[PDB]
PDB file of C-alpha atoms and ligand atoms in Angstrom:
ATOM      1  CA  UNK A  17     103.539 127.213 105.910  1.00 37.67           C
ATOM      2  CA  UNK A  18     100.297 125.807 104.501  1.00 38.32           C
ATOM      3  CA  UNK A  19      97.401 124.597 106.656  1.00 33.40           C
ATOM      4  CA  UNK A  20      99.932 123.217 109.152  1.00 33.49           C
ATOM      5  CA  UNK A  21     102.348 125.559 110.877  1.00 32.27           C
ATOM      6  CA  UNK A  22     105.670 124.544 112.448  1.00 35.58           C
ATOM      7  CA  UNK A  23     108.021 126.206 114.876  1.00 34.40           C
ATOM      8  CA  UNK A  24     110.914 126.606 114.636  1.00 33.62           C
ATOM      9  CA  UNK A  25     111.738 126.262 110.938  1.00 32.24           C
ATOM     10  CA  UNK A  26     115.441 125.717 111.579  1.00 30.78           C
ATOM     11  CA  UNK A  27     117.393 124.416 114.563  1.00 28.51           C
ATOM     12  CA  UNK A  28     121.125 123.792 114.939  1.00 28.58           C
ATOM     13  CA  UNK A  29     122.207 121.925 118.052  1.00 27.47           C
ATOM     14  CA  UNK A  30     125.334 120.245 119.364  1.00 25.08           C
ATOM     15  CA  UNK A  31     125.321 116.464 119.697  1.00 27.32           C
ATOM     16  CA  UNK A  32     123.866 115.252 122.997  1.00 25.93           C
ATOM     17  CA  UNK A  33     121.591 118.309 123.420  1.00 26.10           C
ATOM     18  CA  UNK A  34     117.763 118.360 123.367  1.00 25.42           C
ATOM     19  CA  UNK A  35     115.353 120.045 120.956  1.00 24.36           C
ATOM     20  CA  UNK A  36     111.610 120.650 120.908  1.00 23.79           C
ATOM     21  CA  UNK A  37     109.587 121.370 117.771  1.00 25.53           C
ATOM     22  CA  UNK A  38     105.904 122.337 117.622  1.00 26.52           C
ATOM     23  CA  UNK A  39     103.141 122.112 115.027  1.00 28.39           C
ATOM     24  CA  UNK A  40      99.475 123.014 114.846  1.00 28.21           C
ATOM     25  CA  UNK A  41      96.642 123.341 112.367  1.00 26.03           C
ATOM     26  CA  UNK A  42      93.225 125.015 112.146  1.00 27.86           C
ATOM     27  CA  UNK A  43      91.471 121.750 111.238  1.00 30.59           C
ATOM     28  CA  UNK A  44      90.408 118.991 113.651  1.00 29.33           C
ATOM     29  CA  UNK A  45      92.490 115.839 113.958  1.00 28.46           C
ATOM     30  CA  UNK A  46      95.705 114.710 115.585  1.00 28.48           C
ATOM     31  CA  UNK A  47      99.010 115.425 113.898  1.00 27.26           C
ATOM     32  CA  UNK A  48     101.919 113.018 113.821  1.00 26.88           C
ATOM     33  CA  UNK A  49     105.587 113.700 113.146  1.00 26.86           C
ATOM     34  CA  UNK A  50     107.648 112.372 110.242  1.00 27.52           C
ATOM     35  CA  UNK A  51     111.304 112.774 109.322  1.00 28.86           C
ATOM     36  CA  UNK A  52     112.710 113.137 105.821  1.00 27.46           C
ATOM     37  CA  UNK A  53     116.343 112.748 104.837  1.00 26.83           C
ATOM     38  CA  UNK A  54     117.152 114.498 101.559  1.00 24.13           C
ATOM     39  CA  UNK A  55     114.556 113.581  98.951  1.00 24.81           C
ATOM     40  CA  UNK A  56     113.903 110.174 100.514  1.00 24.64           C
ATOM     41  CA  UNK A  57     110.426 109.017 101.506  1.00 28.07           C
ATOM     42  CA  UNK A  58     109.249 110.466 104.844  1.00 28.29           C
ATOM     43  CA  UNK A  59     109.209 107.990 107.707  1.00 31.20           C
ATOM     44  CA  UNK A  60     107.065 108.054 110.825  1.00 32.77           C
ATOM     45  CA  UNK A  61     109.118 108.626 113.958  1.00 31.14           C
ATOM     46  CA  UNK A  62     109.558 105.867 116.514  1.00 30.31           C
ATOM     47  CA  UNK A  63     110.171 106.456 120.228  1.00 29.41           C
ATOM     48  CA  UNK A  64     113.601 104.817 120.468  1.00 27.81           C
ATOM     49  CA  UNK A  65     112.852 103.966 124.113  1.00 30.76           C
ATOM     50  CA  UNK A  66     111.750 107.489 124.989  1.00 29.49           C
ATOM     51  CA  UNK A  67     114.535 109.400 123.251  1.00 30.40           C
ATOM     52  CA  UNK A  68     112.032 110.812 120.771  1.00 33.62           C
ATOM     53  CA  UNK A  69     108.634 111.686 122.237  1.00 36.10           C
ATOM     54  CA  UNK A  70     105.493 113.127 120.693  1.00 41.81           C
ATOM     55  CA  UNK A  71     103.062 114.888 122.999  1.00 41.43           C
ATOM     56  CA  UNK A  72      99.970 117.032 122.666  1.00 42.40           C
ATOM     57  CA  UNK A  73      99.646 120.303 124.549  1.00 42.82           C
ATOM     58  CA  UNK A  74      96.059 121.264 123.758  1.00 39.07           C
ATOM     59  CA  UNK A  75      96.018 122.320 120.117  1.00 36.59           C
ATOM     60  CA  UNK A  76      99.782 122.089 119.674  1.00 38.36           C
ATOM     61  CA  UNK A  77     101.683 118.891 118.939  1.00 39.19           C
ATOM     62  CA  UNK A  78     105.205 118.779 120.278  1.00 40.30           C
ATOM     63  CA  UNK A  79     108.179 116.618 119.302  1.00 36.08           C
ATOM     64  CA  UNK A  80     110.983 116.262 121.808  1.00 36.36           C
ATOM     65  CA  UNK A  81     114.298 114.815 120.652  1.00 35.21           C
ATOM     66  CA  UNK A  82     116.769 114.095 123.437  1.00 37.67           C
ATOM     67  CA  UNK A  83     120.440 113.167 123.214  1.00 39.14           C
ATOM     68  CA  UNK A  84     120.623 114.399 119.649  1.00 39.85           C
ATOM     69  CA  UNK A  85     122.966 112.528 117.307  1.00 42.32           C
ATOM     70  CA  UNK A  86     123.861 112.145 113.651  1.00 43.22           C
ATOM     71  CA  UNK A  87     120.749 110.166 112.667  1.00 43.82           C
ATOM     72  CA  UNK A  88     118.582 113.114 113.754  1.00 45.09           C
ATOM     73  CA  UNK A  89     119.774 115.335 110.893  1.00 46.37           C
ATOM     74  CA  UNK A  90     116.900 115.942 108.530  1.00 41.82           C
ATOM     75  CA  UNK A  91     113.642 117.731 107.848  1.00 40.93           C
ATOM     76  CA  UNK A  92     110.754 117.171 110.258  1.00 37.79           C
ATOM     77  CA  UNK A  93     107.103 117.689 109.462  1.00 40.89           C
ATOM     78  CA  UNK A  94     103.629 117.013 110.827  1.00 37.24           C
ATOM     79  CA  UNK A  95     100.885 115.344 108.846  1.00 36.65           C
ATOM     80  CA  UNK A  96      97.261 114.569 109.707  1.00 36.49           C
ATOM     81  CA  UNK A  97      97.310 111.252 111.599  1.00 39.05           C
ATOM     82  CA  UNK A  98      94.219 109.935 109.843  1.00 41.00           C
ATOM     83  CA  UNK A  99      93.389 111.663 106.582  1.00 41.03           C
ATOM     84  CA  UNK A 100      90.285 111.067 104.479  1.00 44.47           C
ATOM     85  CA  UNK A 108     103.990 121.697 103.106  1.00 43.39           C
ATOM     86  CA  UNK A 109     106.529 123.424 105.340  1.00 44.87           C
ATOM     87  CA  UNK A 110     109.138 121.661 107.446  1.00 42.90           C
ATOM     88  CA  UNK A 111     111.587 122.090 110.291  1.00 43.58           C
ATOM     89  CA  UNK A 112     115.248 121.408 109.566  1.00 43.36           C
ATOM     90  CA  UNK A 113     117.492 120.013 112.266  1.00 44.05           C
ATOM     91  CA  UNK A 114     121.240 120.328 111.799  1.00 43.29           C
ATOM     92  CA  UNK A 115     123.412 118.505 114.309  1.00 41.91           C
ATOM     93  CA  UNK A 116     126.644 120.363 115.062  1.00 43.58           C
TER      94      UNK A 116
HETATM   95  N1  GSH B   1      93.710 102.835 118.468  1.00 47.07           N
HETATM   96  C1  GSH B   1      94.271 102.702 117.121  1.00 47.07           C
HETATM   97  C2  GSH B   1      93.725 103.812 116.188  1.00 47.07           C
HETATM   98  C3  GSH B   1      92.833 103.309 115.085  1.00 47.07           C
HETATM   99  C4  GSH B   1      92.272 104.246 114.040  1.00 47.07           C
HETATM  100  O1  GSH B   1      91.703 105.473 114.424  1.00 47.07           O
HETATM  101  N2  GSH B   1      92.337 103.851 112.771  1.00 47.07           N
HETATM  102  C5  GSH B   1      91.895 104.702 111.680  1.00 47.07           C
HETATM  103  C6  GSH B   1      92.989 104.850 110.627  1.00 47.07           C
HETATM  104  S1  GSH B   1      94.358 105.910 111.177  1.00 47.07           S
HETATM  105  C7  GSH B   1      90.674 104.150 111.006  1.00 47.07           C
HETATM  106  O2  GSH B   1      89.660 105.006 110.532  1.00 47.07           O
HETATM  107  N3  GSH B   1      90.610 102.830 110.867  1.00 47.07           N
HETATM  108  C8  GSH B   1      89.194 102.225 110.289  1.00 47.07           C
HETATM  109  C9  GSH B   1      88.765 100.888 110.885  1.00 47.07           C
HETATM  110  O3  GSH B   1      89.436 100.374 111.815  1.00 47.07           O
HETATM  111  O4  GSH B   1      87.752 100.378 110.370  1.00 47.07           O
HETATM  112  C10 GSH B   1      95.826 102.682 117.077  1.00 47.07           C
HETATM  113  O5  GSH B   1      96.464 103.413 117.850  1.00 47.07           O
HETATM  114  O6  GSH B   1      96.391 101.920 116.169  1.00 47.07           O
HETATM  115 MG1   MG B   2     116.567 124.150 104.901  1.00 47.42          MG
END
């Protein structure tokens, strides 16, 4: 990873299960999660009525994806929320 570290780097989960990813950096500023499918443009994650939740646990930013399904396949990464690259791959089994 670069200036932003993510854990895990790979997760494989059966449909309907839950996953939690974590990211942090040594700089100040909130991080926000994005999802990338293939080489497409990254898109900011939306809550989907609480199915996908971003929280902050001190210095660590956590993404929780519940009831995992096909649309969740992809590469997840954190970026500085407001800004004056490693990722986490999710494979749905
Ligand atoms: N409370 C706002 C956050 C606003 C904010 O911090 N905006 C940043 C950009 S990410 C900024 O510097 N905006 C400059 C301005 O409003 O003049 C929200 O959740 O939308
Ligand atoms: Mg990979």
